Amino acid sequence: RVTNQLQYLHKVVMKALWKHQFAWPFRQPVDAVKLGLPDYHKIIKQPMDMGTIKRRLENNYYWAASECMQDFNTMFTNCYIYNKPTDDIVLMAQTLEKIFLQKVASMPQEEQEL
Ligand SMILES: CC(=O)NCc1onc(C)c1-c1ccc(C)c(S(=O)(=O)NC2CCCC2)c1
Numbered sequence: 001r002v003t004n005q006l007q008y009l010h011k012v013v014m015k016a017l018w019k020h021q022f023a024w025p026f027r028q029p030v031d032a033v034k035l036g037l038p039d040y041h042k043i044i045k046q047p048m049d050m051g052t053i054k055r056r057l058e059n060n061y062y063w064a065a066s067e068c069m070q071d072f073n074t075m076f077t078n079c080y081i082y083n084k085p086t087d088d089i090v091l092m093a094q095t096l097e098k099i100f101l102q103k104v105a106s107m108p109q110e111e112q113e114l
Contacts, residue, residue, distance in 0.1 A: 005065030
């Protein structure tokens with residue numbers, strides 16, 4: 001579906017996050033081979049990234065805004081779960097997620113299909 005809320009997540013939320021200076025590690029799936037992390041996929045069972053979310057928004061994959069929101073959440077949560085407390089990546093995720101939440105607080109309240 002196209003909804004008012006999904007249009008918002010696409011044109012306001014993703015728009016802001018995608019171009020953020022800290023976005024680059026999150027624009028594509030975590031590549032466990034490239035990064036030397038052979039336990040990554042044993043720990044994280046549902047990988048998620050903004051490239052996947054963006055593509056899903058562009059292709060009208062989502063039925064409701066909450067589904068898109070859950071994918072954003074999964075991406076951040078995977079990052080906090082997998083990495084060490086002191087890894088810079090965790091700070092970058094937090095910075096992006098703060099913006100995610102700020103923008104979500106202003107999303108149109110009632111979902112309507114267009
Ligand atoms: C999709 C997603 O969540 N990506 C971020 C992410 O989540 N878990 C891992 C691991 C990652 C992640 C993705 C890409 C890179 C390159 C890295 S890193 O730790 O090697 N580099 C960081 C420190 C220096 C700059 C960035 C971590």
